[PDB]
Design goal:
This is part of a larger assembly, with chains A (119 residues), B (51 residues), C (82 residues) and D (67 residues). With 119 residues, chain A is α+β, with helices and mostly antiparallel strands. In chain A, 23% of the residues lie in helices and 29% in strands. In chain A, the strands form 2 sheets. In chain A, strands 2-1-8-3-4-5 form a 6-stranded mixed β-sheet. Classes of the chains: A alpha+beta (119), B mainly alpha (51), C alpha+beta (82), D mainly alpha (67). Chain A binds 3 RNA strands through helix 1, helix 2, strand 1 and helix 4. Chain C: Belongs to the universal ribosomal protein uL23 family.
Chain lengths: 119, 51, 82, 67
RNA sequence: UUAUGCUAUCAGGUGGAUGGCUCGGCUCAAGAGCUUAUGAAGGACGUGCCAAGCUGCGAUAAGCCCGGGGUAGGUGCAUGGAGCCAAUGAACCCGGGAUUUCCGAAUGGGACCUCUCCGUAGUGAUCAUUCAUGAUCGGGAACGCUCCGAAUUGAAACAUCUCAGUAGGAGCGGGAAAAGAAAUCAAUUGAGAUGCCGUAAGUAACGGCGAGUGAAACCGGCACAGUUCAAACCGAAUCCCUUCGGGGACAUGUGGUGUUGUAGGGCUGUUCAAACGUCUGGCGGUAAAAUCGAACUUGCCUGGAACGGCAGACCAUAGAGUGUGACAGUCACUUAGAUGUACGCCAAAAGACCGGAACAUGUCCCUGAGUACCGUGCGUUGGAUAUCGUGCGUGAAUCUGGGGGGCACCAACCUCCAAAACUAAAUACUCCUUGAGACCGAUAGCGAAAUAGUAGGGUGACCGAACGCUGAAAAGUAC
RNA sequence: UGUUCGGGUCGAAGCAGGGCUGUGAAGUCCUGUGGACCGUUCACAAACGAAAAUCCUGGUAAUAGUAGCAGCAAAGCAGGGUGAGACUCCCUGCCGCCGAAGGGGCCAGGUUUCCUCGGCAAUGUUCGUCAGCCGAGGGUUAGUCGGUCCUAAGACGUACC
RNA sequence: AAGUCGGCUUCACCCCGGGACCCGUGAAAAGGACAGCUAAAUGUCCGUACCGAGAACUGACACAGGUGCCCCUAGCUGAAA
C-alpha cells in the first residue's frame, strides 16, 4: 500500500523496498480467474504455495501448475513445471512474479483463507 | 611483559578476535559483495588505540 | 546465574581426565568460590580445588580437581563427553 | 514443533518447570561442549531453540513470581 | 622484410570518462515536540550452529511474554550449507509488559582504570519547620532567558567610532520561552495589557557631525483576558501529614474581606440579588496496526520477454504514481471514495459548589523604602544637558499624597498610581513525522547512495577519505 | 519547466570513425558498437559552455628495466634429502661471525608475533617448498612470583570561602 | 657411567666492623618483634604465552638512530669488563 500522499518515485520505491513482511504478503497478489472472482467477490488474491495458477506472461504463458514455493523478500513464486535447465542439465525452478500469473484453483486447507482473500 | 588489567586484556582479546577474515560462507551468501572488512590489521603496524 | 558454560573439550583439556581434572569455560564475572559451589550443585561431586585463567578469546577457563576418584569421568559421561 | 510451548509451561507445576529448566540447561551444556571441539553440531538450530525455550520458561517463571 | 623510428587508422590490454538508471542528499512547507535516580543519553564488553563488521539485543543477550491487525511462510544488512521455528496462527506491524552485564548524572569507597575493595546489602552532595517522605543533578538539532565579553575588518593609516554586545564563555530552562494588565502613550478635548508582523524609515537621534550607526509613537493586521497579594476591618474563624488515634505549622498572623486613579478599598447604612469561575458528567468528534476499493491481462505482428504497433472490449468521485522480462486507468500495489480502530485526547446536554453589583455619609483608617529621586564614575544606547544599567555617596512623601508630559525651575492644563505576584493565544526553532520540489544525480548532492565521523592521521584539542550498477531468470559455464 | 508536435527493442542515449550543410558557435545523416530511453514548436529559467590558475581529484607515460638491493661483519662450500620447481627450506661435515655482546634475564611498550598443521596471490629489497606472511586449530593454571597493602614528591574528592 | 676426595683463589655477591667528609645530614608510613602452643577450615580478584630488539617496542619500514637496563657474563694474554 502506498497512498497518493506521495507521488514521488523515490518515496514509492523506498516504500516498496523497505516494505514490512506483512505488506510484502500483499505483494504476492494475483488476478483470480473469472469463476473465482465471481464466486469470491474480489478481483485478486495472494498467491499461496500449493494452489494452481496459469502463467499468462513471459516464456511460460498458459502453463498451469501448483505453487511450489513462495519468497516474500524476493516477491517470487515457484510453480511446478516452470524450470530452467542449467549447464549441468539439471532442472532448477525459475521464480515468477505473481502479477504474471492467474489463479485457477485455490488451496483451501486453511479455514482462514476466505477472510484472508476478502475481509 | 607489560601488565594489563582485566578490562585491558579483554579489549585486547576483542581486537584479536576482530582481526579475522570474512567467512567464506558469508562471501557466498553475499555473492562476493561483502569480501572486505574495516577491522583487518597487522600486529606490526600502527598500534591499537584500545589499551 | 550459572558460572559454568560448558565442558571445554580440547586435547589438553582431555588430558585432564586421566588425572581426574576437568576443564570448563565459565562466566568471567564469577570467581573460584562461585564456580566451585555451582559445579558442586550441578553434579553432586565435592570439588578439591579450582584453578582459573583468562584467555585471549576473552573467555575464562577453570580446571577443577575433584576429591572423589572417577568423579571427572562420571561427570564427563553424564554430559556426553565420554 | 518446538520443545515446549507457553501453554505447556503454564500448565506444568513449579517443580516441573524447574526440572525442565535443569534438563534444558543440561542439554545446552552438552551441545556447547560438543561445539567446543570445533566440530559442527548435529543440530545447529537445537542450541538456539533451547536458549529461547529457556528464556520463555524464565519469563513465565518471573510472571508467576517464581523468580 | 630499412633496423631504430615518425604520422594516421584499425584490433586488443589498462583505465573508468560518457550515457542511462538510482532505496541517497539538499532545501522549503505542514505537523509534532521534552527526557533521566522506577538509573537516561553515550560508551565498553558480551550475544548468532557455521558470525569478522554494522544493526538489534543484554548472561532470558539479531532475543522472551500478553492483547489486537495480518496469515503462510519466517530465520536483519546478506537467497550459502545444515537445521530450527510456524495452522497450539509464526514472521511482520500497533499497544502494553518482562529481562536489561560494567562504566556513565553515577550516587557505599577507589578508579591507574571500564574494573576493583569492603562487604556492616550501601539516603554521593546540597536542600524542604510531620523527620513518614520529597526535590535538584545528566541528556536534547536549533530556538528561549540572565550575565561576562575580543580582534581581524571599515574609516582606503588610526585612537572615539565601526566590526559588535558580534564570535566565544558561564548560569538557567520548556515545548515553547520571555513580556504582560500603565506611577503608559498622546496633545489642545484622545486612546487603553503584552507579544509578533507591516509601516513610520535610513526619518528623528548619535557621530574625528567623517565613515558609519539608528529608533519609537501614531496607524493597518494576527490573536485577544484578565487578575492575585501586602495593609486597613475580623482574629485561628485556618493549611498540611496521618498508621485516622494523633502529629505539624500558625498571635513575629494561617484563613475571611480587598486590590485601585474624572481614585480605590475598609468602617456605618440602604437596595438589587448573585455574573464569571472550580468540579462531576461523558451526546458527539478526534483516534493503532489495519479493511474494502471500478474496469483486459483478448486476436495478429515484432520480440527472449509486450506495458509497444495494428484491430477489439471496458472503468473513471479512480488518467497521482510505483512494481511487473520494453512505454500499463483496466496485471499487482495503489489511486478517487468509503470503512474500522484498544489506550488516550477534546467535548457538548444536565447537575454540585465559594460567590456578585449599585448608591448615601466622612477633623475616620489603609494603599509596597535605603525604595523613588538626586550627586558623581563607568558601561551601553539613536537617546542628544532628554536611553537603560549599577558602583559609590546621599536620600524623601503618604490622598490636604506621589509620579510623568525628551535641560532645570515656576505656574496652568492633561495624564497616571510605581517601588510585590501570576496570566492562555497570536511568535521562534527543527532531533523527529509527513508532504513537496525549474534542486543534485555518484569527482555532483551531506564527509558519508555505505560494515561513515568509518578506514586512516595527530600524545591531545582535533583532522578525515575512497568504494553504486551481471542477467528476465544464476540459467553463476557440464564434460 | 510550461506548452505544440513526435521518435525508440524492425534498436533511444552515449561512444569510434566518416559524408553533407552552415563564415562559425554547431546541426544533421552513414557505418560499427550499444540495449532503453530521446527529441521538437513558441516561451521561460540556470549549480549553462575551459587549454591554461607552480589549479583540484583520478588515471597513466618518458625517465627505465635505469638508480638501489655494496660500510653492517671473513657472508659460504661439499654430499644427501624434500619438492612440479631449490644459491636461498631440512640433515651431516668443513669453513666462518658475535663471544663484558649479536649470548642469558627482564621494565616500559607490543598484543598472539608463541606452538602445531596446511599454503605461497600479496609481504620479505632476489628466489622460496621457508617465515614474525596467509588460512585452520591450540596454548598463559599461584596463599608463597608480582599487583593487591604502606606511604614519598604530589595529585584528586567533599566542605568552607 | 662414575658418582669418591683434597688444595688454591674469590670478584663484581652476603655478613660484620672501623675511619674520613658536610657542602646536599642523606624519607615516610604500613608491617614486624617483644607471649604464644595445638587441631580443623579458609586464603577471593587481576597478570602469567612470546619479543624485549641490526625483524616482535618507537622513529610511516623486517629503518646502521633511539628506547630500562642488569645490584648479568667463562679460558689465555694483559692493570683490566
Amino acid at each position: 500500500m502506498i497512498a497518493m500522499v506521495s507521488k514521488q518515485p523515490r518515496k514509492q520505491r523506498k516504500a516498496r523496498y523497505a516494505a514490512p513482511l506483512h505488506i510484502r504478503q500483499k505483494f504476492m497478489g494475483a488476478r483470480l480467474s473469472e469463476a473465482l472472482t465471481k464466486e469470491y467477490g474480489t478481483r485478486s488474491a495472494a498467491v499461496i504455495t500449493g494452489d494452481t495458477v496459469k502463467v499468462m506472461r513471459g516464456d511460460f504463458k498458459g502453463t498451469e501448475g501448483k505453487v511450489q514455493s513462495v519468497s516474500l523478500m524476493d516477491g517470487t513464486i515457484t510453480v511446478d513445471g516452470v524450470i530452467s535447465t542449467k549447464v549441468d542439465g539439471t532442472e532448477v525452478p525459475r521464480p515468477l512474479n505473481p502479477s504474471n500469473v492467474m489463479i485457477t484453483k485455490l488451496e483451501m486447507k486453511d479455514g482462514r483463507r476466505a477472510s484472508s482473500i476478502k475481509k | 611483559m607489560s601488565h594489563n588489567m582485566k578490562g585491558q586484556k579483554k579489549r585486547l582479546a576483542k581486537a584479536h578476535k576482530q582481526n579475522t577474515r570474512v567467512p567464506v560462507w558469508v562471501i557466498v551468501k553475499t555473492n562476493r559483495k561483502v569480501v572486505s572488512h574495516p577491522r583487518r590489521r597487522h600486529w606490526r603496524r600502527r598500534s591499537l588505540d584500545v589499551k | 546465574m550459572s558460572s559454568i558454560n560448558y565442558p571445554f573439550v580440547t586435547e589438553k583439556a582431555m588430558m585432564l581426565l586421566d588425572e581426574n581434572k576437568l576443564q570448563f569455560i565459565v562466566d568471567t564475572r564469577s570467581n573460584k568460590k562461585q564456580i566451585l559451589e555451582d559445579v558442586e550443585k550441578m553434579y553432586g561431586f565435592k570439588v578439591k580445588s579450582v584453578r582459573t585463567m583468562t584467555t585471549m578469546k576473552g573467555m575464562k577457563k577453570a580446571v577443577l580437581a575433584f576429591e572423589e576418584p572417577e568423579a571427572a569421568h562420571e561427570i564427563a559421561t553424564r554430559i556426553g563427553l565420554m | 514443533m518446538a520443545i515446549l510451548r507457553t501453554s505447556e509451561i503454564r500448565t506444568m507445576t513449579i517443580e516441573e518447570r524447574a526440572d525442565e529448566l535443569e534438563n534444558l540447561n543440561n542439554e545446552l551444556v552438552r551441545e556447547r561442549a560438543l561445539t567446543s571441539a570445533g566440530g559442527a553440531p548435529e543440530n545447529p538450530g537445537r542450541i538456539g531453540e533451547i536458549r529461547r525455550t529457556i528464556a520463555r520458561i524464565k519469563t513465565i517463571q518471573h510472571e508467576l513470581n517464581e523468580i
